[PDB]
Design a protein around this nucleic acid. Structure first.
Lengths: 233, 118
RNA sequence: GUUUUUUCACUGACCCGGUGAGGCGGGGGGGCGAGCCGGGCUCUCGCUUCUGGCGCCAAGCGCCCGGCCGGCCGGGCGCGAC
RNA sequence: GCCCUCAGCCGAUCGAAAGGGAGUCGGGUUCAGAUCCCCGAAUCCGGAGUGGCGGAGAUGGGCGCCGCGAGGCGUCCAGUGC
Protein backbone atom coordinates (compact mmCIF):
# COMPACT_ATOMS: atom_id res chain seq x y z
CA UNK A 1 0.00 0.00 0.00
CA UNK A 2 2.61 2.54 1.21
CA UNK A 3 5.49 4.15 -0.76
CA UNK A 4 9.17 3.54 0.30
CA UNK A 5 10.21 6.88 -1.37
CA UNK A 6 8.87 9.27 1.30
CA UNK A 7 11.26 10.21 4.16
CA UNK A 8 10.48 11.77 7.55
CA UNK A 9 12.83 14.69 8.04
CA UNK A 10 13.05 16.29 11.49
CA UNK A 11 14.44 19.63 12.59
CA UNK A 12 16.64 20.26 15.59
CA UNK A 13 15.71 23.68 17.02
CA UNK A 14 18.34 23.34 19.78
CA UNK A 15 20.67 26.20 20.20
CA UNK A 16 22.78 26.97 17.16
CA UNK A 17 21.44 24.49 14.69
CA UNK A 18 18.22 25.25 12.89
CA UNK A 19 16.48 28.64 12.57
CA UNK A 20 13.88 28.95 15.33
CA UNK A 21 10.23 28.61 14.61
CA UNK A 22 7.41 31.17 14.44
CA UNK A 23 5.66 31.31 17.77
CA UNK A 24 3.68 32.69 20.79
CA UNK A 25 5.08 36.16 21.58
CA UNK A 26 2.27 38.11 23.31
CA UNK A 27 4.20 38.44 26.46
CA UNK A 28 7.21 40.30 24.93
CA UNK A 29 5.51 42.68 22.39
CA UNK A 30 6.02 46.45 22.56
CA UNK A 31 2.46 47.62 23.01
CA UNK A 32 1.16 51.14 22.31
CA UNK A 33 1.08 53.82 24.87
CA UNK A 34 -2.74 53.75 25.30
CA UNK A 35 -2.75 50.14 26.40
CA UNK A 36 0.53 50.21 28.35
CA UNK A 37 -1.27 52.70 30.57
CA UNK A 38 -4.55 50.88 31.21
CA UNK A 39 -3.01 47.50 32.09
CA UNK A 40 -0.95 49.33 34.89
CA UNK A 41 -3.82 51.41 36.26
CA UNK A 42 -5.09 48.00 37.66
CA UNK A 43 -1.64 46.95 39.22
CA UNK A 44 -1.60 50.18 41.35
CA UNK A 45 -4.90 48.93 42.88
CA UNK A 46 -3.43 45.70 44.37
CA UNK A 47 -0.03 47.06 45.60
CA UNK A 48 -1.29 50.40 46.79
CA UNK A 49 -3.16 50.56 50.03
CA UNK A 50 -6.63 51.17 48.86
CA UNK A 51 -8.42 52.62 51.91
CA UNK A 52 -11.60 51.11 53.24
CA UNK A 53 -14.53 53.23 51.84
CA UNK A 54 -13.52 52.90 48.10
CA UNK A 55 -12.49 49.27 48.93
CA UNK A 56 -16.16 48.14 49.35
CA UNK A 57 -16.80 48.37 45.53
CA UNK A 58 -14.89 45.08 44.91
CA UNK A 59 -17.55 43.56 47.24
CA UNK A 60 -20.26 42.54 44.70
CA UNK A 61 -23.46 40.40 44.45
CA UNK A 62 -22.92 36.79 43.20
CA UNK A 63 -24.32 34.80 40.20
CA UNK A 64 -27.62 33.20 41.42
CA UNK A 65 -28.82 36.55 42.96
CA UNK A 66 -27.75 38.84 40.04
CA UNK A 67 -29.74 36.85 37.38
CA UNK A 68 -32.71 36.57 39.84
CA UNK A 69 -32.81 40.31 40.80
CA UNK A 70 -33.18 41.41 37.11
CA UNK A 71 -36.41 39.31 36.66
CA UNK A 72 -38.46 41.23 39.31
CA UNK A 73 -37.13 44.49 37.77
CA UNK A 74 -38.13 43.00 34.35
CA UNK A 75 -41.86 43.52 35.27
CA UNK A 76 -41.32 47.09 36.62
CA UNK A 77 -39.33 48.62 33.72
CA UNK A 78 -40.09 52.05 32.25
CA UNK A 79 -42.16 51.89 29.00
CA UNK A 80 -40.38 52.09 25.60
CA UNK A 81 -40.13 55.35 23.55
CA UNK A 82 -42.63 53.84 21.04
CA UNK A 83 -45.19 53.24 23.87
CA UNK A 84 -45.50 57.04 24.35
CA UNK A 85 -47.13 57.25 20.84
CA UNK A 86 -50.11 54.99 21.87
CA UNK A 87 -50.56 56.41 25.43
CA UNK A 88 -50.49 60.17 24.62
CA UNK A 89 -52.50 59.28 21.47
CA UNK A 90 -54.91 57.06 23.55
CA UNK A 91 -56.25 60.16 25.42
CA UNK A 92 -57.56 61.79 22.18
CA UNK A 93 -59.56 58.61 21.23
CA UNK A 94 -61.62 58.27 24.46
CA UNK A 95 -62.06 62.06 25.11
CA UNK A 96 -62.58 63.10 21.40
CA UNK A 97 -64.81 60.06 20.47
CA UNK A 98 -51.99 56.47 39.67
CA UNK A 99 -48.69 55.34 38.08
CA UNK A 100 -47.84 51.59 37.97
CA UNK A 101 -44.64 50.76 39.96
CA UNK A 102 -41.39 51.68 38.14
CA UNK A 103 -37.67 52.61 38.74
CA UNK A 104 -35.75 55.78 39.78
CA UNK A 105 -32.67 56.43 37.54
CA UNK A 106 -29.73 58.69 38.54
CA UNK A 107 -27.87 59.65 41.75
CA UNK A 108 -29.67 63.02 42.25
CA UNK A 109 -33.09 61.23 42.41
CA UNK A 110 -31.83 58.33 44.65
CA UNK A 111 -29.92 60.27 47.37
CA UNK A 112 -32.89 62.54 48.25
CA UNK A 113 -35.68 59.84 48.43
CA UNK A 114 -33.60 57.36 50.55
CA UNK A 115 -33.48 60.09 53.27
CA UNK A 116 -37.08 61.27 52.41
CA UNK A 117 -38.25 57.89 53.89
CA UNK A 118 -40.08 56.23 50.96
CA UNK A 119 -37.86 53.53 49.31
CA UNK A 120 -37.45 49.83 50.19
CA UNK A 121 -34.31 48.48 48.40
CA UNK A 122 -31.36 50.46 46.87
CA UNK A 123 -28.90 49.11 44.22
CA UNK A 124 -25.41 50.37 43.21
CA UNK A 125 -23.07 49.73 40.24
CA UNK A 126 -19.36 48.91 40.87
CA UNK A 127 -17.22 50.56 38.12
CA UNK A 128 -18.22 54.14 38.87
CA UNK A 129 -15.81 56.30 36.85
CA UNK A 130 -14.74 59.43 38.54
CA UNK A 131 -15.27 57.67 41.86
CA UNK A 132 -16.33 60.85 43.89
CA UNK A 133 -19.96 60.70 42.66
CA UNK A 134 -20.66 57.69 45.03
CA UNK A 135 -18.10 57.72 47.96
CA UNK A 136 -20.62 59.25 50.44
CA UNK A 137 -23.63 57.00 49.61
CA UNK A 138 -23.12 53.54 51.32
CA UNK A 139 -22.56 55.13 54.81
CA UNK A 140 -25.87 57.07 54.35
CA UNK A 141 -27.86 53.84 53.65
CA UNK A 142 -26.10 52.39 56.78
CA UNK A 143 -27.81 54.73 59.32
CA UNK A 144 -31.32 55.29 57.91
CA UNK A 145 -32.30 51.67 57.20
CA UNK A 146 -32.31 51.31 53.40
CA UNK A 147 -30.12 48.16 52.65
CA UNK A 148 -27.57 48.63 49.80
CA UNK A 149 -26.10 46.05 47.36
CA UNK A 150 -23.48 46.23 44.55
CA UNK A 151 -23.82 44.51 41.12
CA UNK A 152 -20.84 44.15 38.73
CA UNK A 153 -21.96 46.14 35.65
CA UNK A 154 -22.87 49.83 35.49
CA UNK A 155 -23.35 49.11 31.87
CA UNK A 156 -26.04 46.47 32.47
CA UNK A 157 -27.84 48.53 35.13
CA UNK A 158 -28.53 51.25 32.59
CA UNK A 159 -29.81 48.59 30.22
CA UNK A 160 -32.95 48.32 32.34
CA UNK A 161 -33.55 51.98 31.47
CA UNK A 162 -32.73 52.63 27.90
CA UNK A 163 -29.42 54.50 28.01
CA UNK A 164 -25.73 53.80 27.96
CA UNK A 165 -24.86 53.71 31.71
CA UNK A 166 -26.23 54.38 35.12
CA UNK A 167 -25.05 54.37 38.78
CA UNK A 168 -27.97 53.75 41.21
CA UNK A 169 -31.56 52.46 40.61
CA UNK A 170 -33.96 52.42 43.64
CA UNK A 171 -37.43 50.94 44.36
CA UNK A 172 -40.23 52.91 46.11
CA UNK A 173 -43.31 50.87 44.91
CA UNK A 174 -44.09 47.15 44.25
CA UNK A 175 -47.41 45.41 43.36
CA UNK A 176 -49.50 43.04 45.55
CA UNK A 177 -48.62 40.20 43.08
CA UNK A 178 -44.94 40.56 44.16
CA UNK A 179 -44.88 41.37 47.92
CA UNK A 180 -43.15 38.10 49.01
CA UNK A 181 -40.26 38.08 46.48
CA UNK A 182 -39.33 41.72 47.35
CA UNK A 183 -39.61 41.00 51.12
CA UNK A 184 -37.38 37.91 50.42
CA UNK A 185 -34.32 39.58 48.71
CA UNK A 186 -34.06 42.30 51.44
CA UNK A 187 -33.23 39.56 54.04
CA UNK A 188 -30.52 37.94 51.81
CA UNK A 189 -28.96 41.43 51.33
CA UNK A 190 -29.28 43.14 54.78
CA UNK A 191 -27.60 40.49 57.04
CA UNK A 192 -24.33 40.65 54.99
CA UNK A 193 -24.37 44.39 54.00
CA UNK A 194 -26.05 46.43 56.84
CA UNK A 195 -25.33 44.01 59.73
CA UNK A 196 -21.66 43.30 58.82
CA UNK A 197 -21.32 46.92 57.51
CA UNK A 198 -19.08 47.47 60.56
CA UNK A 199 -16.94 44.55 59.31
CA UNK A 200 -16.73 46.47 56.06
CA UNK A 201 -15.36 49.64 57.66
CA UNK A 202 -12.05 47.99 58.83
CA UNK A 203 -11.09 46.07 55.75
CA UNK A 204 -8.21 47.83 53.89
CA UNK A 205 -7.29 46.66 50.40
CA UNK A 206 -3.65 46.62 49.22
CA UNK A 207 -0.03 45.65 50.11
CA UNK A 208 -0.15 42.47 47.99
CA UNK A 209 2.66 42.11 45.54
CA UNK A 210 3.14 40.74 42.08
CA UNK A 211 4.42 37.19 42.19
CA UNK A 212 7.90 38.06 40.98
CA UNK A 213 8.74 38.52 44.65
CA UNK A 214 6.23 36.20 46.41
CA UNK A 215 8.39 33.33 45.01
CA UNK A 216 11.82 34.83 45.97
CA UNK A 217 10.82 35.74 49.53
CA UNK A 218 8.98 32.44 49.97
CA UNK A 219 12.07 30.91 48.42
CA UNK A 220 14.27 32.26 51.34
CA UNK A 221 11.70 31.51 54.14
CA UNK A 222 12.38 27.83 53.49
CA UNK A 223 16.03 28.94 53.87
CA UNK A 224 15.12 29.54 57.54
CA UNK A 225 13.35 26.13 57.68
CA UNK A 226 16.17 23.65 56.72
CA UNK A 227 18.64 25.38 59.15
CA UNK A 228 16.10 24.88 62.02
CA UNK A 229 15.26 21.30 60.80
CA UNK A 230 18.74 19.63 60.54
CA UNK A 231 19.99 21.52 63.68
CA UNK A 232 17.32 20.10 66.03
CA UNK A 233 16.60 16.46 65.00
CA UNK B 1 -5.56 33.11 15.54
CA UNK B 2 -2.21 33.79 17.41
CA UNK B 3 0.83 36.20 17.83
CA UNK B 4 4.11 35.84 15.91
CA UNK B 5 6.05 39.14 15.51
CA UNK B 6 7.00 41.26 18.49
CA UNK B 7 5.78 44.58 17.04
CA UNK B 8 2.42 46.32 16.98
CA UNK B 9 1.51 48.05 13.71
CA UNK B 10 -1.86 49.98 13.20
CA UNK B 11 -4.63 47.98 11.60
CA UNK B 12 -6.07 48.73 8.21
CA UNK B 13 -9.36 50.72 8.16
CA UNK B 14 -12.07 51.29 5.55
CA UNK B 15 -12.21 54.52 3.58
CA UNK B 16 -15.32 55.64 1.74
CA UNK B 17 -15.55 57.75 -1.37
CA UNK B 18 -16.42 61.50 -1.38
CA UNK B 19 -20.01 62.19 -2.30
CA UNK B 20 -20.58 65.85 -1.98
CA UNK B 21 -23.89 67.55 -1.09
CA UNK B 22 -23.30 70.70 -3.32
CA UNK B 23 -20.79 70.99 -6.18
CA UNK B 24 -18.44 73.74 -5.05
CA UNK B 25 -18.28 76.05 -8.13
CA UNK B 26 -21.42 76.18 -10.26
CA UNK B 27 -19.86 75.30 -13.60
CA UNK B 28 -16.45 74.12 -14.78
CA UNK B 29 -13.92 77.10 -15.42
CA UNK B 30 -13.66 77.65 -19.23
CA UNK B 31 -10.62 77.08 -21.48
CA UNK B 32 -9.03 80.08 -22.98
CA UNK B 33 -6.29 78.41 -25.07
CA UNK B 34 -8.46 77.75 -28.06
CA UNK B 35 -7.06 77.20 -31.47
CA UNK B 36 -7.59 81.01 -31.79
CA UNK B 37 -5.63 82.21 -28.75
CA UNK B 38 -2.74 79.91 -29.42
CA UNK B 39 -1.81 81.15 -32.90
CA UNK B 40 -1.15 84.90 -32.98
CA UNK B 41 0.17 86.40 -36.37
CA UNK B 42 2.37 84.96 -39.12
CA UNK B 43 5.89 86.34 -39.15
CA UNK B 44 7.00 87.81 -42.44
CA UNK B 45 10.51 89.09 -42.41
CA UNK B 46 13.29 88.65 -45.03
CA UNK B 47 14.40 85.57 -43.16
CA UNK B 48 10.93 83.95 -42.80
CA UNK B 49 10.31 84.29 -46.53
CA UNK B 50 13.63 82.48 -47.02
CA UNK B 51 12.04 79.58 -44.92
CA UNK B 52 8.93 79.17 -47.14
CA UNK B 53 10.00 78.73 -50.74
CA UNK B 54 13.31 76.99 -49.94
CA UNK B 55 12.61 74.49 -47.14
CA UNK B 56 8.83 74.23 -47.59
CA UNK B 57 7.97 75.56 -43.97
CA UNK B 58 6.15 78.49 -42.23
CA UNK B 59 6.87 80.81 -39.31
CA UNK B 60 4.32 81.61 -36.56
CA UNK B 61 3.92 83.52 -33.21
CA UNK B 62 2.35 81.73 -30.40
CA UNK B 63 1.02 82.11 -26.79
CA UNK B 64 4.05 81.56 -24.62
CA UNK B 65 2.19 78.87 -22.44
CA UNK B 66 1.69 76.75 -25.56
CA UNK B 67 3.07 73.27 -25.99
CA UNK B 68 4.40 71.83 -29.19
CA UNK B 69 1.83 69.14 -29.05
CA UNK B 70 -0.98 71.75 -28.68
CA UNK B 71 0.34 74.00 -31.51
CA UNK B 72 0.60 71.11 -34.04
CA UNK B 73 -3.25 70.51 -34.11
CA UNK B 74 -4.03 74.27 -34.30
CA UNK B 75 -1.98 74.54 -37.57
CA UNK B 76 -3.79 71.32 -38.52
CA UNK B 77 -7.42 72.36 -37.74
CA UNK B 78 -7.78 75.93 -39.35
CA UNK B 79 -5.73 76.02 -42.67
CA UNK B 80 -6.11 72.10 -43.16
CA UNK B 81 -2.69 70.78 -43.77
CA UNK B 82 -0.62 68.02 -42.11
CA UNK B 83 2.70 68.73 -40.24
CA UNK B 84 6.18 67.07 -39.98
CA UNK B 85 7.70 68.98 -37.00
CA UNK B 86 7.30 72.23 -34.92
CA UNK B 87 10.58 73.76 -33.45
CA UNK B 88 10.37 76.64 -30.91
CA UNK B 89 12.25 79.34 -29.04
CA UNK B 90 11.50 82.51 -27.11
CA UNK B 91 12.74 86.03 -28.14
CA UNK B 92 14.66 88.72 -26.10
CA UNK B 93 11.45 90.79 -26.28
CA UNK B 94 9.68 87.76 -24.80
CA UNK B 95 7.30 85.89 -27.18
CA UNK B 96 7.15 82.35 -28.56
CA UNK B 97 8.10 81.77 -32.23
CA UNK B 98 7.40 78.31 -33.71
CA UNK B 99 9.08 77.09 -36.98
CA UNK B 100 6.59 74.83 -38.74
CA UNK B 101 7.92 72.32 -41.27
CA UNK B 102 5.25 70.91 -43.72
CA UNK B 103 4.49 67.69 -45.74
CA UNK B 104 5.77 66.81 -49.29
CA UNK B 105 2.29 66.37 -50.84
CA UNK B 106 1.44 69.79 -49.41
CA UNK B 107 3.10 73.01 -50.76
CA UNK B 108 4.53 76.06 -48.90
CA UNK B 109 4.39 79.10 -51.22
CA UNK B 110 0.94 77.88 -52.26
CA UNK B 111 -0.74 77.71 -48.82
CA UNK B 112 1.10 80.99 -47.89
CA UNK B 113 -0.96 82.82 -50.51
CA UNK B 114 -4.24 81.49 -49.18
CA UNK B 115 -3.68 83.04 -45.75
CA UNK B 116 -1.99 86.37 -46.82
CA UNK B 117 1.74 86.26 -46.21
CA UNK B 118 3.42 87.13 -49.44
C1' G C 1 -1.70 52.52 71.35
C1' U C 2 0.76 57.63 69.84
C1' U C 3 5.10 59.23 68.70
C1' U C 4 11.05 60.35 69.47
C1' U C 5 14.89 57.93 66.24
C1' U C 6 19.28 54.18 64.74
C1' U C 7 20.23 50.15 61.34
C1' C C 8 19.23 46.37 57.43
C1' A C 9 15.66 45.06 54.09
C1' C C 10 11.54 45.84 50.14
C1' U C 11 9.08 48.46 44.52
C1' G C 12 4.49 50.68 43.22
C1' A C 13 6.75 56.77 42.01
C1' C C 14 10.85 58.26 39.90
C1' C C 15 16.14 57.48 36.75
C1' C C 16 19.64 54.79 33.30
C1' G C 17 21.41 50.95 29.40
C1' G C 18 19.48 47.10 25.78
C1' U C 19 16.63 45.27 21.53
C1' G C 20 12.81 44.50 14.82
C1' A C 21 10.53 45.40 23.11
C1' G C 22 12.02 36.93 20.39
C1' G C 23 12.34 32.29 24.84
C1' C C 24 12.34 35.92 31.85
C1' G C 25 9.93 34.05 36.57
C1' G C 26 6.97 29.41 39.15
C1' G C 27 5.69 24.01 38.46
C1' G C 28 5.84 19.38 35.35
C1' G C 29 8.37 15.90 31.93
C1' G C 30 13.30 12.87 30.36
C1' G C 31 18.82 12.19 30.34
C1' C C 32 24.11 12.19 33.78
C1' G C 33 25.50 11.83 38.55
C1' A C 34 25.19 12.07 44.83
C1' G C 35 23.16 8.95 49.27
C1' C C 36 19.01 5.59 51.95
C1' C C 37 15.59 -0.12 51.26
C1' G C 38 10.18 -1.45 41.96
C1' G C 39 9.81 3.31 46.31
C1' G C 40 10.46 8.60 47.17
C1' C C 41 13.95 12.60 49.51
C1' U C 42 18.35 16.59 47.95
C1' C C 43 20.29 18.27 43.37
C1' U C 44 23.97 18.75 38.73
C1' C C 45 22.30 19.16 33.47
C1' G C 46 18.27 19.82 28.88
C1' C C 47 21.64 17.88 22.71
C1' U C 48 25.79 23.05 18.18
C1' U C 49 34.60 23.62 17.99
C1' C C 50 37.94 19.44 14.07
C1' U C 51 38.02 22.19 7.42
C1' G C 52 37.94 30.28 4.94
C1' G C 53 30.75 24.44 2.87
C1' C C 54 25.13 24.19 3.34
C1' G C 55 20.54 25.86 6.62
C1' C C 56 13.77 30.13 5.78
C1' C C 57 8.58 29.70 3.54
C1' A C 58 7.33 21.21 7.69
C1' A C 59 8.21 15.78 6.40
C1' G C 60 5.94 12.26 9.87
C1' C C 61 1.48 11.01 12.75
C1' G C 62 -3.78 11.63 14.27
C1' C C 63 -9.18 13.65 13.44
C1' C C 64 -12.96 15.27 10.41
C1' C C 65 -15.04 17.72 5.18
C1' G C 66 -17.03 18.49 -0.10
C1' G C 67 -16.46 16.99 -5.64
C1' C C 68 -16.47 12.47 -10.32
C1' C C 69 -17.89 6.63 -11.25
C1' G C 70 -13.56 0.46 -3.89
C1' G C 71 -10.30 4.22 -6.90
C1' C C 72 -9.53 9.75 -9.10
C1' C C 73 -9.30 15.29 -6.99
C1' G C 74 -9.24 19.42 -3.45
C1' G C 75 -9.62 22.21 1.71
C1' G C 76 -9.65 22.36 7.71
C1' C C 77 -7.46 21.54 13.46
C1' G C 78 -3.51 19.70 16.06
C1' C C 79 2.67 17.67 16.96
C1' G C 80 7.05 20.78 16.84
C1' A C 81 7.71 25.75 22.51
C1' C C 82 4.64 20.91 27.63
C1' G D 1 -15.78 45.30 -2.47
C1' C D 2 -14.51 42.46 1.40
C1' C D 3 -11.54 38.45 3.74
C1' C D 4 -6.95 35.09 4.29
C1' U D 5 -2.09 35.37 4.58
C1' C D 6 2.89 37.90 2.62
C1' A D 7 6.10 42.84 3.57
C1' G D 8 12.06 44.71 8.45
C1' C D 9 13.30 49.47 8.10
C1' C D 10 14.79 53.96 9.53
C1' G D 11 12.60 58.42 8.78
C1' A D 12 8.92 63.82 5.01
C1' U D 13 11.45 67.07 1.86
C1' C D 14 15.98 69.99 0.01
C1' G D 15 21.19 70.36 -1.19
C1' A D 16 26.17 69.84 -7.13
C1' A D 17 24.54 74.28 -14.90
C1' A D 18 33.35 71.54 -12.38
C1' G D 19 31.06 64.61 -8.24
C1' G D 20 27.41 60.21 -9.95
C1' G D 21 24.32 59.76 -14.40
C1' A D 22 21.66 55.10 -20.98
C1' G D 23 21.92 57.25 -26.29
C1' U D 24 25.22 61.76 -32.51
C1' C D 25 28.48 61.60 -35.76
C1' G D 26 30.05 63.55 -40.99
C1' G D 27 29.45 67.13 -45.67
C1' G D 28 26.85 71.70 -46.88
C1' U D 29 24.25 76.53 -45.75
C1' U D 30 23.65 82.53 -43.31
C1' C D 31 25.42 89.88 -42.98
C1' A D 32 24.17 87.77 -37.98
C1' G D 33 22.32 80.77 -35.92
C1' A D 34 23.93 75.80 -35.87
C1' U D 35 26.88 68.20 -32.73
C1' C D 36 20.01 72.36 -32.80
C1' C D 37 18.68 74.27 -40.09
C1' C D 38 18.86 70.82 -44.71
C1' C D 39 21.29 66.18 -47.58
C1' G D 40 23.24 61.68 -45.76
C1' A D 41 24.65 57.94 -42.22
C1' A D 42 23.59 55.76 -37.37
C1' U D 43 21.02 54.36 -32.64
C1' C D 44 19.13 54.76 -26.50
C1' C D 45 14.42 54.11 -23.39
C1' G D 46 9.59 53.83 -23.19
C1' G D 47 4.84 51.21 -25.79
C1' A D 48 2.14 47.09 -28.12
C1' G D 49 -4.89 46.05 -26.32
C1' U D 50 -5.97 42.01 -31.89
C1' G D 51 1.13 41.33 -28.95
C1' G D 52 3.28 41.99 -37.01
C1' C D 53 6.09 38.21 -39.31
C1' G D 54 10.89 34.28 -39.07
C1' G D 55 13.48 31.38 -36.23
C1' A D 56 14.35 28.64 -30.82
C1' G D 57 11.31 25.35 -27.27
C1' A D 58 10.61 20.43 -31.46
C1' U D 59 10.09 16.87 -33.29
C1' G D 60 12.44 11.37 -31.57
C1' G D 61 12.75 5.49 -29.79
C1' G D 62 11.24 0.58 -29.74
C1' C D 63 7.30 -3.64 -31.79
C1' G D 64 3.21 -5.12 -34.97
C1' C D 65 0.05 -5.02 -40.25
C1' C D 66 1.08 -4.44 -45.94
C1' G D 67 5.31 -2.97 -49.50
C1' C D 68 10.99 -5.86 -54.09
C1' G D 69 12.51 -1.19 -51.26
C1' A D 70 11.75 4.49 -49.95
C1' G D 71 7.23 4.98 -46.79
C1' G D 72 2.45 3.96 -45.31
C1' C D 73 -1.12 2.16 -40.47
C1' G D 74 -2.58 1.80 -35.77
C1' U D 75 -0.86 1.06 -30.38
C1' C D 76 2.74 2.53 -25.77
C1' C D 77 6.65 5.26 -23.12
C1' A D 78 10.83 9.79 -23.79
C1' G D 79 11.70 15.21 -25.39
C1' U D 80 12.31 23.36 -20.15
C1' G D 81 18.67 22.77 -26.22
C1' C D 82 23.50 21.31 -27.26
Amino acid sequence: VVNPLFEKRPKNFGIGQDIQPKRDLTRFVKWPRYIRLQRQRAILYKRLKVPPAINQFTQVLDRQTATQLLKLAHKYRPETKQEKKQRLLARAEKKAAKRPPVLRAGVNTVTTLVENKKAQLVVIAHDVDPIELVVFLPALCRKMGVPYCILKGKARLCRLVHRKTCTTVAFTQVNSEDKGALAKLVEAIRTNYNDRYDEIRRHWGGNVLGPKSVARIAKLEKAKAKELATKLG
Amino acid sequence: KIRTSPTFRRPKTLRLRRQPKYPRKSAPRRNKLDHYAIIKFPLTTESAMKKIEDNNTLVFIVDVKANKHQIKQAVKKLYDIDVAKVNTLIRPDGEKKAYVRLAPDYDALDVANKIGII
